[PDB]
């Protein structure tokens, strides 16, 4: 496996870790996306303490309107964050 291929499996994995906690096992409810941002993206995103942040983040990501973040929606999220960090090497 290349670093890249592993990196892709890691993204699938982190998503599985949090999306299976509660509710729909294949999507992220707000609490899970919150726990995921706070536990796994602490160095890239300000810790989320206010509900209104989670709501706004979910509103951005939920493009099919079901109130949750499915996997493809999660990749879009990962591309945003990664694209923000990369400007460090713009």
């Amino acid at each position: 496996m290349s670093e890249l291929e592993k990196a892709m499996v890691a993204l699938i994995d982190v998503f599985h870790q949090y999306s299976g906690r509660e509710g729909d096992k294949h999507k992220l409810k707000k609490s899970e996306l919150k726990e995921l941002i706070n536990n796994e993206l602490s160095h890239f995103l300000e810790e989320i303490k206010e509900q209104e942040v989670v709501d706004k983040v979910m509103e951005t990501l939920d493009n099919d309107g079901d109130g949750e973040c499915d996997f493809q929606e999660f990749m879009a999220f990962v591309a945003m964050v990664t694209t923000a960090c990369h400007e460090f090497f713009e």
Binding site: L41, H43, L45, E46, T60, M80
Partner: peptide, 9 residues
């Protein structure tokens, strides 16, 4: 580090 709600696309 940035606030998560500012992320857009």
């Amino acid at each position: 580090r940035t606030e998560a709600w500012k992320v857009l696309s």
